[PDB]
Motif scaffolding. Structure first.
Motif, short mmCIF file in Angstrom:
data_model
loop_
_atom_site.label_atom_id
_atom_site.label_comp_id
_atom_site.label_asym_id
_atom_site.label_seq_id
_atom_site.Cartn_x
_atom_site.Cartn_y
_atom_site.Cartn_z
N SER A 1 -7.70 -13.19 -7.97
CA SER A 1 -6.27 -13.35 -7.75
C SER A 1 -5.49 -12.25 -8.47
N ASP A 2 -6.21 -11.24 -8.95
CA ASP A 2 -5.61 -10.09 -9.61
C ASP A 2 -5.46 -8.90 -8.69
N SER A 3 -6.44 -8.65 -7.82
CA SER A 3 -6.28 -7.65 -6.78
C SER A 3 -5.26 -8.09 -5.73
N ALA A 4 -4.96 -9.39 -5.65
CA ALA A 4 -3.99 -9.84 -4.67
C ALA A 4 -2.59 -9.38 -5.04
N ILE A 5 -2.29 -9.31 -6.34
CA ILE A 5 -1.00 -8.80 -6.77
C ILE A 5 -0.88 -7.32 -6.43
N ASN A 6 -1.98 -6.58 -6.57
CA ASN A 6 -1.97 -5.15 -6.28
C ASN A 6 -1.79 -4.88 -4.79
N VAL A 7 -2.39 -5.72 -3.94
CA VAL A 7 -2.20 -5.58 -2.50
C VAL A 7 -0.75 -5.86 -2.14
N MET A 8 -0.14 -6.86 -2.79
CA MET A 8 1.27 -7.15 -2.54
C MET A 8 2.16 -6.04 -3.09
N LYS A 9 1.74 -5.39 -4.17
CA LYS A 9 2.45 -4.21 -4.65
C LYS A 9 2.39 -3.09 -3.62
N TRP A 10 1.18 -2.77 -3.15
CA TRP A 10 1.02 -1.74 -2.12
C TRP A 10 1.85 -2.05 -0.89
N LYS A 11 1.92 -3.33 -0.51
CA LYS A 11 2.72 -3.72 0.65
C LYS A 11 4.19 -3.38 0.44
N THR A 12 4.69 -3.56 -0.79
CA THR A 12 6.08 -3.21 -1.07
C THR A 12 6.29 -1.70 -1.10
N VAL A 13 5.39 -0.97 -1.75
CA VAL A 13 5.54 0.48 -1.87
C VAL A 13 5.47 1.14 -0.50
N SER A 14 4.55 0.69 0.36
CA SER A 14 4.35 1.35 1.65
C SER A 14 5.54 1.14 2.58
N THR A 15 6.20 -0.02 2.51
CA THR A 15 7.39 -0.23 3.33
C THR A 15 8.58 0.57 2.81
N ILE A 16 8.72 0.66 1.48
CA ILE A 16 9.78 1.49 0.91
C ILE A 16 9.54 2.96 1.25
N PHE A 17 8.28 3.39 1.19
CA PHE A 17 7.94 4.76 1.56
C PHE A 17 8.36 5.07 2.99
N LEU A 18 8.05 4.16 3.93
CA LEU A 18 8.44 4.36 5.32
C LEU A 18 9.96 4.39 5.46
N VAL A 19 10.67 3.53 4.73
CA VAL A 19 12.13 3.53 4.78
C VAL A 19 12.67 4.86 4.28
N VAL A 20 12.09 5.39 3.21
CA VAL A 20 12.53 6.69 2.69
C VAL A 20 12.23 7.79 3.70
N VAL A 21 11.06 7.74 4.33
CA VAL A 21 10.72 8.72 5.37
C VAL A 21 11.73 8.63 6.52
N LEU A 22 12.06 7.41 6.94
CA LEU A 22 13.10 7.24 7.95
C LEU A 22 14.43 7.83 7.49
N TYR A 23 14.81 7.55 6.24
CA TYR A 23 16.03 8.11 5.68
C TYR A 23 16.04 9.63 5.76
N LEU A 24 14.92 10.27 5.44
CA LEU A 24 14.84 11.72 5.52
C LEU A 24 14.92 12.21 6.96
N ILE A 25 14.31 11.47 7.89
CA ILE A 25 14.33 11.88 9.30
C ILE A 25 15.75 11.78 9.86
N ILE A 26 16.43 10.67 9.58
CA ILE A 26 17.80 10.49 10.07
C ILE A 26 18.72 11.54 9.45
N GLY A 27 18.63 11.72 8.14
CA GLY A 27 19.46 12.72 7.48
C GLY A 27 19.20 14.13 7.99
#
Ligand code: 16C
Ligand code: WUU
Ligand code: WUU
Ligand code: R16
Ligand code: R16
Ligand code: R16
Ligand code: R16
Ligand code: R16
Ligand code: R16
Ligand code: R16
Ligand code: R16
Ligand code: R16
Ligand code: R16
Ligand code: R16
Ligand code: R16
Ligand code: R16
Ligand code: K
Ligand code: K
Ligand code: K
Ligand code: K
Ligand code: K
Lengths: 274, 282
Positions: A1-27
């Motif tokens: 149940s310790d790697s599960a927190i890391n997977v949920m961390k990765w899930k948050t980072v990867s969606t923020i990364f995509l949002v930032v990539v979208l932000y750069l594309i739109i800008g």
């Protein structure tokens, strides 16, 4: 149940990364649409007056004028009196690297590395202390007007929203509106360019296209000192504003996550009601 | 939430303020001594080539030669290549550069080599920065969290191996921080400086110079990776974006550590002058 927190961390980072990539594309597409047509105009003006200067001066050779342009450009690749070196030291430790003047002596580049690595943290202590002082000053003011609202106004959770608006309007007038008025008069800039300079400087972006005190015109003895003072309290204000905008984005991120929850749940019972 | 603590806080701010002024004074004099001889020498050489062009073309009004230089320089700020040999100019605001420019905004590494001149572009730049900077901060925090756990797992492997002869109390923390510095330096500073020297054709110092000025978000603009007109390996600018991502996270941790060290040395100096202030020559 310790790697599960890391997977949920990765899930948050990867969606923020995509949002930032979208932000750069739109800008990027917006900056392209805004700045490319203007780029057409000024590159037609350089080619008309190029040949015009050849036409206006037929004695000047084509072969001998192009040889002049290259060493001008090569030369772009006193600026270092104690006043400018002081200002330059400020642009380093504040990370507002305007870059209008930068070290080219290889010894100067080594010292610039050492100066920054110690200067950035040390100035960070100063900027924190100034922000703390400005925080308490605004605190008493916002506490006084809080206690006036609790008299006629019933309940809370609403007074904080009002109080945050005062912080913006006052902070905008003190640290953005007022210096932009002085900047347009003293520096001879446009009203928008003054706001543009204020925000680009206080966000520590520091493009260098606009620098207060940078032009070689007469400046009053108090002018650059008070701009140094504006830099001090201005960076503290923009630091709080940028952090508050980040707090707003955190709330909007949860509302959008909740909004998409209500949406697909409704669309589910409707496709089931079929 | 007021009281006596605010007076003691203010006293600290004023001493740090004075120290910062001293830091600015010392740095100014050093940059003065280093950069002034080079600029004086080469501005006498431009006057040598000034008068050479002045003598060679008496038809040019000579006083009007500065009139041509000003419109060259003013156009160089927009980035023009005004040569009859290279009359084919490529865009500075294509989707690739506008992407790169948007990165220099939200990262606050405002290199400024290209900047908006449309008054609409400046308005959008203000909105883009005010929303972009906080949003990118969340990404940089997540990347720092990711690098933290990776270093955590790496240090976790050796954690139980440290139980050896000389089991330590306060010394094991220092060793782990040394790995963080030296490893982090080769990964995020030394290695990219090596590729910067080969691909961009920079000197070894200029590569280190670029790395620190970029990763500290100073961003002078005298050195920009991918800015010069070379073909580039197609993989280059993407992988530099990745270095920017993890590099900014790394330098954030290093800068905070230097601040923690500065806090410790500030108290050691405060106590050192204390034993001094009490002794007064025995
Ligand atoms: C300092 C004020 C005087 C101004 C001019 C003196 C030269 C600069 C002093 C650096 C050491 C002198 C020895 C040779 C230096 C040059 O070859 C040059 C250094 O920039 N390039 C190197 O690769 C150096 C070869 C060593 C390879 C190690 C990595 C290169 C980094 C550059 C030097 C260390 C920088 C320290 C940063 C913390
Ligand atoms: C060299 C020529 C010149 O005039 N110059 C210069 C000196 C001083 C300033 C200045 O003080 N600007 C206000 C200021 C202070 C601190 C910070 Cl971090 C930013 C700003 Cl805009 C500007 C330019 C030279 O560099
Ligand atoms: C327009 C001409 C050109 O070539 N150019 C440009 C495009 C892309 C890059 C680049 O990606 N540099 C690496 C990078 C990425 C992001 C950030 Cl924040 C910094 C850096 Cl150094 C550079 C230059 C133009 O602008
Ligand atoms: C996309 C999955 C989110 C699940 C993670 C828990 C919610 C908290 C996310 C809010 C932003 C991350 C921490 C804030 C950064 C200081
Ligand atoms: C931190 C206080 C320093 C005072 C401001 C110095 C800025 C650079 C020196 C240029 C002229 C000194 C002030 C005159 C205003 C134009
Ligand atoms: C607490 C208010 C600070 C606003 C001062 C910043 C002004 C920026 C340019 C300095 C111009 C000097 C004259 C201003 C006199 C009030
Ligand atoms: C580095 C030089 C800075 C210039 C010093 C001027 C600071 C502010 C002006 C104070 C004017 C002195 C008269 C007393 C009235 C305030
Ligand atoms: C935690 C997962 C990421 C969820 C992010 C929610 C949407 C992103 C925020 C919106 C970006 C700026 C909106 C401002 C209005 C144009
Ligand atoms: C980025 C420019 C403006 C913001 C609008 C697009 C942001 C992307 C929306 C992604 C929605 C996912 C929400 C996460 C919850 C599942
Ligand atoms: C972005 C869609 C994939 C490539 C489509 C061609 C668009 C322009 C050609 C090369 C520029 C790549 C985009 C630069 C920023 C990612
Ligand atoms: C494409 C430029 C000229 C076309 C005709 C004028 C359109 C209006 C200017 C384009 C947007 C800049 C101003 C927007 C700021 C409120
Ligand atoms: C030392 C391992 C720490 C995790 C960092 C490695 C990156 C991969 C994260 C794990 C989640 C799977 C990635 C999804 C496929 C791109
Ligand atoms: C497809 C060839 C890339 C060359 C185009 C220059 C722009 C670089 C595009 C890379 C964008 C992805 C990185 C985003 C990380 C925040
Ligand atoms: C160790 C923390 C003591 C509490 C000090 C109050 C907050 C101020 C931060 C550190 C004080 C000055 C540090 C010296 C900067 C080089
Ligand atoms: C709260 C007392 C003020 C802190 C004074 C800082 C002392 C720094 C000692 C000098 C160590 C060399 C590093 C350069 C200065 C930060
Ligand atoms: C590059 C070095 C700049 C500053 C070097 C030392 C500055 C002053 C340190 C001594 C101050 C002692 C504080 C004691 C307060 C009780
Ligand atoms: K910063
Ligand atoms: K710059
Ligand atoms: K910055
Ligand atoms: K910057
Ligand atoms: K900059």
């Amino acid at each position: 149940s310790d790697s599960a927190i890391n997977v949920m961390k990765w899930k948050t980072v990867s969606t923020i990364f995509l949002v930032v990539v979208l932000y750069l594309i739109i800008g990027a597409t917006v900056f392209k649409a805004l700045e490319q047509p203007q780029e057409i105009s000024q590159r037609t003006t350089i080619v008309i007056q190029r040949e015009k200067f050849l036409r206006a001066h037929p004695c000047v050779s084509d072969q001998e004028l192009d040889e002049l342009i290259q060493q001008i450009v090569a030369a772009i690749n006193s600026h270092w009196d104690l006043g400018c070196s002081f200002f330059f030291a400020g642009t380093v430790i504040t990370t507002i690297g305007f870059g209008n003047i930068s070290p080219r002596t290889e010894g100067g580049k080594i010292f610039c590395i050492i100066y920054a690595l110690l200067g950035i943290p040390l100035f960070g202590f100063l900027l924190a202390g100034v922000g703390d002082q400005l925080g308490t000053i605004f605190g008493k003011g916002i506490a006084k007007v809080e206690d006036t609202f609790i008299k006629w106004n019933v309940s809370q959770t609403k007074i904080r929203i009002i109080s945050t608006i005062i912080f913006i309007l006052f902070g905008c007038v003190l640290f953005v509106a007022l210096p932009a008025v002085i900047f347009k008069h003293i520096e001879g800039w446009s009203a928008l360019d003054a706001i543009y300079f204020v925000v680009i400087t206080l966000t520590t972006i520091g493009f260098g296209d606009y620098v207060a005190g940078g032009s070689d015109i007469e400046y009053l003895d108090f002018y650059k000192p008070v701009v140094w003072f504006w830099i001090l309290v201005g960076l503290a204000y923009f630091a709080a504003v940028l952090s508050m905008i980040g707090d707003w984005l955190r709330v909007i991120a949860k509302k959008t996550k909740e909004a998409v929850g209500e949406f697909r749940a409704h669309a589910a019972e409707w496709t089931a009601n079929v």
